[PDB]
Amino acid sequence: MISVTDLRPGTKVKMDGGLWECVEYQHQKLGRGGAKVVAKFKNLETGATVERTFNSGEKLEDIYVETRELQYLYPEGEEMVFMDLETYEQFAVPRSRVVGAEFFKEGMTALGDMYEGQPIKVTPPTVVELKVVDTPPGVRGDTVSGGSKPATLETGAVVQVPLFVEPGEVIKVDTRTGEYVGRA
Numbered sequence: 001m002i003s004v005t006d007l008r009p010g011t012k013v014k015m016d017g018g019l020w021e022c023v024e025y026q027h028q029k030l031g032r033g034g035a036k037v038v039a040k041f042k043n044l045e046t047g048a049t050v051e052r053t054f055n056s057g058e059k060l061e062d063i064y065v066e067t068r069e070l071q072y073l074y075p076e077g078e079e080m081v082f083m084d085l086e087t088y089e090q091f092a093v094p095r096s097r098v099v100g101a102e103f104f105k106e107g108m109t110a111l112g113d114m115y116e117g118q119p120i121k122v123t124p125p126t127v128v129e130l131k132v133v134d135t136p137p138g139v140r141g142d143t144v145s146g147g148s149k150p151a152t153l154e155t156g157a158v159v160q161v162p163l164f165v166e167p168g169e170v171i172k173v174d175t176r177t178g179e180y181v182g183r184a
Contacts, residue, residue, distance in 0.1 A: 002062040004037040004054040012044065014061045015052075019044040019115060027056065044113060045097070045120050063115065070112040070122060072104045080104065082112065082122065091119050098122045100175030102157040105130060124175045129184040130154055131170050132161065139163045151180075 002011070011022040024040035035056035042049050044065065054060075070082035070091065079092045080101065091112070095101045097120065104110070104124060112119040135151035136142075141163055142149055148160040153173070161171060161180045170184035 001059045003056075004039070004058045004060060005035075005056055007037065007039050007060070012063050012065050013041070014063045015041070015050075018046075018048075019063060019065070019120060020050070023049075024051075029056070044115075065120075066114045067111050068114055070110055070119065072106060072108045072110065074106055080122075082110075082119070084112075085109070093119050093122055098124075100124055100128075100178060103128055103130060103153070103155055103173055103175050103178065105155055126174060126176060127172050127181060128175055129170050130157075130173055132165060132167055135161060135165065135167055137166060 005027055007022045007025050009023055009025060013020050013022070020041035020043055022039050023042050026038040027035065028038070029035035037054045037056055038051065040049060040051045069085045071085055073081045073083055076092060079094055080098055082091050082093055084091065098104070099122065108124060108128065110122050110124040113121045130153045132151045133154050136149050140149060141147070148162055150158055151161040151165060152158050159173060159178065159180050165171060165183065171180055172182045172184055173179065174181050
């Protein structure tokens with residue numbers, strides 16, 4: 001347990017059954033009034049955020065979460081199998097816990113957030129490089145006047161790419177938005 005006044009951006013805690021990370025902290029006391037702590041948290045598993053107000057003397061359940069490098073090996077049903085590059089432990093991770101799962105090339109390395117020895121989230125670099133395996137050659141866009149065309153990547157994912165991108169070309173993809181950001 002930790003005192004709410006010890007919270008700081010980055011502190012990880014367990015609240016209402018959820019795992020969170022403090023992102024904003026404010027400790028305040030006005031006159032003879034009791035001191036308060038107002039803090040914002042972002043979930044470590046979902047996209048939820050929450051802001052809470054505590055009395056300065058309250059406590060929270062601090063948790064330990066370690067980030068380790070995991071290498072994607074292969075898919076298995078609705079799960080993705082990774083190898084921990086430090087401990088060599090194999091983990092079968094549900095695709096829903098993997099950010100930008102469709103942009104994972106076998107052999108790619110990502111960062112896994114570990115809680116109680118198991119990954120609760122796996123995040124690849126913001127930008128990854130993937131090869132275009134199928135896209136209309138030349139200026140064959142899907143619209144008459146658009147400046148882009150659909151392209152199937154080596155992972156099976158499909159994204160819009162400029163007309164000048166050709167089959168076999170390696171592109172850069174933002175794993176957060178799932179969009180083309182440039183040529184490799």
